[PDB]
């Protein structure tokens, strides 16, 4: 109810402020335009208010002109500032206090004086006119009794307009009323996860009465709500309320015994129970199965959530007096679902935008080190005055009183001039404010969140090479295939990637897998490891998907972090029934647990590590004397292993793999730089101690061959470093900070590893 | 009058005497079977063998219904039906000893269950079991004393044709609020497709599931106003609230016109409402078979085109 | 004062936390005679964690004893 | 180190692969020889005498008794 209740006089103020901005060269319409427009309309009840207070039109124009500035502006786009929008919000409350249902020019002055932050409020203060003085000025210048007591009426509350209007339910609300077109089969059930916002559905039904958009049946229909918070004599009060519904014919029940009532059809009750507790009681009863059917009411999409907050924009941008931009709302929902996706939607966005708007309000509503230095002196002078009056020293007290008055005069002038520029501007909601708040919920650095998703994909190969040196064929193969689905070329339903790890164990498959999550999700530990060693029997299939009803893993874990990497170890050793489940993941992109909840895997990366074909790769290395198969093309190696892979598995299963990944072998030169990387990583952990470690190439070569083994790979390298470098390094640490802040040089003389201590 | 049994259990003859619940329709075959077992000298304790949810509850309800209707034979004439729920289960054994004494003295109390070996051995208590088949072969069959005292009764799902008569019998009991007309074609069409898709809960509970949200887009859809009362009522709303404000504002120059306009609008609203219902109450909105299959489309996900053949 | 709240002797409390790990092998051999092949393996594996090389979130040690 | 390698292969046969990766160091023990057992009995004599410090009783055991 914005312009419906506006009278002729109220609407004239809107046009007056529009034209005044052009003459005043103001690109925005603030409180200085609304106050002057009201003074130009001496037709309302407030006309006698200003006349009785010796307030004219010419005096307020010059008073407000000095406070505001003058400068170049933009022609057109003259909209209302959020601070001036507080008048509309408060005018509704004033009407409810006096049980009035009209909006006129008599509430504009109250709104501009109840803010105490706009330019118009300061004009009233300078004219010895406050809220109390004008409080009494306006005064003199001016049925289902049982149902209403045992429940709450929604159309009564919605008539005033105190609750937030339901915005974004343009399909769920319309779906309910479309089915509500017969005496029978007219009991829809709101089925969805707890937190999707099924309570607002009841409010939306009563909202149509206020807006007169309801049909004849719903016209002036009391939407009753039976809350669950008010819970022999149990089945006694409910039998009297239902009698009033039949006779009146305008009472709607909203639940969150009654079986005979719905056998014929007379109550348009709409359920709100969750899916986990709806098929266990309603479905098992034949009588309750003739009126109730589950309805798909889930959380809104990313785009849908944005539209929800657009309707509620006026309920928050004016309450906090903070300008809310369109780009802030769309970025808030996208970033919230990226990291904190446990409370579902849209309830997790209401509080997120509330703290974001409040945080910028706090930062833009303080003293810029100007009024603080003046107020402290005023307080100190006040203490000095007390020290003189109690001391009976009035000779020095005369100067204190004069100085106190002078400081207070400067305090008001400094405070007014500080907010003169503040009132002329509006504090918008920058995208950085939302990013800072969401960063504090998960601990992710601001740099990682602040990405345009344009350079990360381009530099994907470089990031992977930082953690893994060598086997560039496997690095480039996965980087090119992963971006195919991101750009939209691949099927959206299918997952982003379905790479399969093949080759000898211990080569570093796990190390490369963790780098994928680091460079994409920005989290090294965002990976769920499921081992098929414990999945051998047939009954193990009902474990990762969830316990079937009637008896009492992976689905539960992946739901918390859908933006992770799912890694499997020893996939070749698993029950045949497990492979059928995996095929559905890579085909439809989503699964469903035993509780009816549909989980999503479009953001998950499925990697299956198998040891099949490892014996073939190692034979090719020593097949030819004087060399190996490393010089062969990667496609040739892929084709040879493809035939072996399909021998033990099904041919149709491999058709769903985006790219088969075959790892290479580790040579002597490859391990040399691996040792170098680990030393640098240890130096990073020693940055607090500010100790530099340098390792010569002689030491790297000696330690590389100490645990070299084709079957193991890079695994013995970690053990060798611990027993060679870390053993002597730890001894010097516990020597009284002997090597603290210094530089340590590691050199291999041929038999031992001599350590040289030098300055840094 | 067995006061102990009337307080520690639930009486069925009192509920059936008022007849406020829907009558048991389609279980007429089991009505004669229950009384037949109770009349036998040996194994006079029938057991409702079957899965929980097939309709074993209606079997006990119909037993007491024949008492009010005077359809029970002389052997089972003027006998109350008592059922002991499993939710009221040491001090537990101290209550069952007093209840069995009253049953023997009265001679007309029939127990219904869902320690007692000496009671069943002598046939003093004519309890009717309701345990499932899985639990009947694990605790009752293992005991020889109760093997020759409990007579199993095959209580399974009824036939497809038997379910059809259930809807027809209860049709008259389903039209007493808004006086709507239900076509006979939808009754037979509500059992053919019920077993085709929903076959996980057995008859008749799984059978009567199609008519829940199938055809509800005809009757009240035409009861709406095509932009007729959407604006007339809105005009009345604004005049009333604005009228009260003008009274306290000492503004009766425009209030006089508002009262005449409001009175005229009230007369028009009644005339528009009366003519709307007069031209619609005469016609009847019967069910159609084209919308019966619409509800089952969303239960399983099958497109409506595939179902409609 | 802190000695009277836990019963720890004053000598144990007054330590530099550095000489204790330097003579760890000598102290362990006072109560454990023999099996020196495992004494040195665990002594050199605990000082590295205290030196800050190991990740602070992880526990100090994760030894797995094996044998008869 | 060779003994550690041989035991490691059999250790992962009945255990999860990544379970042993997080272990800082696998520790393998040995048996007890006759010479080691001689000092083990000696330690128990010293511990028993230490517990009798309040008794102010000195206990000395010959090497012949320890071997027996
Ligand atoms: N190119 C490389 N550069 C640096 N370090 C490497 C490289 N390749 C492998 N590594 C190291 O090898 C180590 C091997 O240990 P890890 O627990 O990751 O097992 P893995 O060899 O990947 O085998 P598995 O798949 O059987 O678990 C990793 O911790 C990683 O630091
Ligand atoms: N290295 C050692 N030197 C001397 N005595 C030892 C040594 N190791 C063990 N002992 C002795 O072994 C005895 C038995 O110790 P304890 O009862 O704790 O069992 P354990 O041998 O460690 O075996 P378990 O692991 O089966 O409990 C102790 O009294 C201890 O004196
Ligand atoms: N589509 C929507 N439009 C406006 N407000 C909504 C919407 N969905 C939820 N809300 C608001 O979110 C708040 C929380 O509702 P919630 O408790 O999640 O309902 P439920 O418990 O039924 O899921 C409600 O007060 C409601 O006003």
Curated annotation (Swiss-Prot), chain D:
It comes from the Bacteria. Disulfide bonds: none annotated. Induction: By heat shock. Transcriptionally regulated by CtsR. Up-regulated by heavy metals such as Cu(2+) and Cd(2+), but Zn(2+) and Co(2+) have no effect. Forms part of an operon with ctsR, mcsA and mcsB. Belongs to the ClpA/ClpB family. ClpC subfamily. May interact with ClpP. Required for growth at high temperatures, probably by acting as a chaperone during heat shock and targeting heat-denatured proteins for degradation by ClpP. Required for biofilm formation. May act as a chaperone regulating CtsR activity. This is ATP-dependent Clp protease ATP-binding subunit ClpC. It comes from Staphylococcus aureus (strain NCTC 8325 / PS 47).
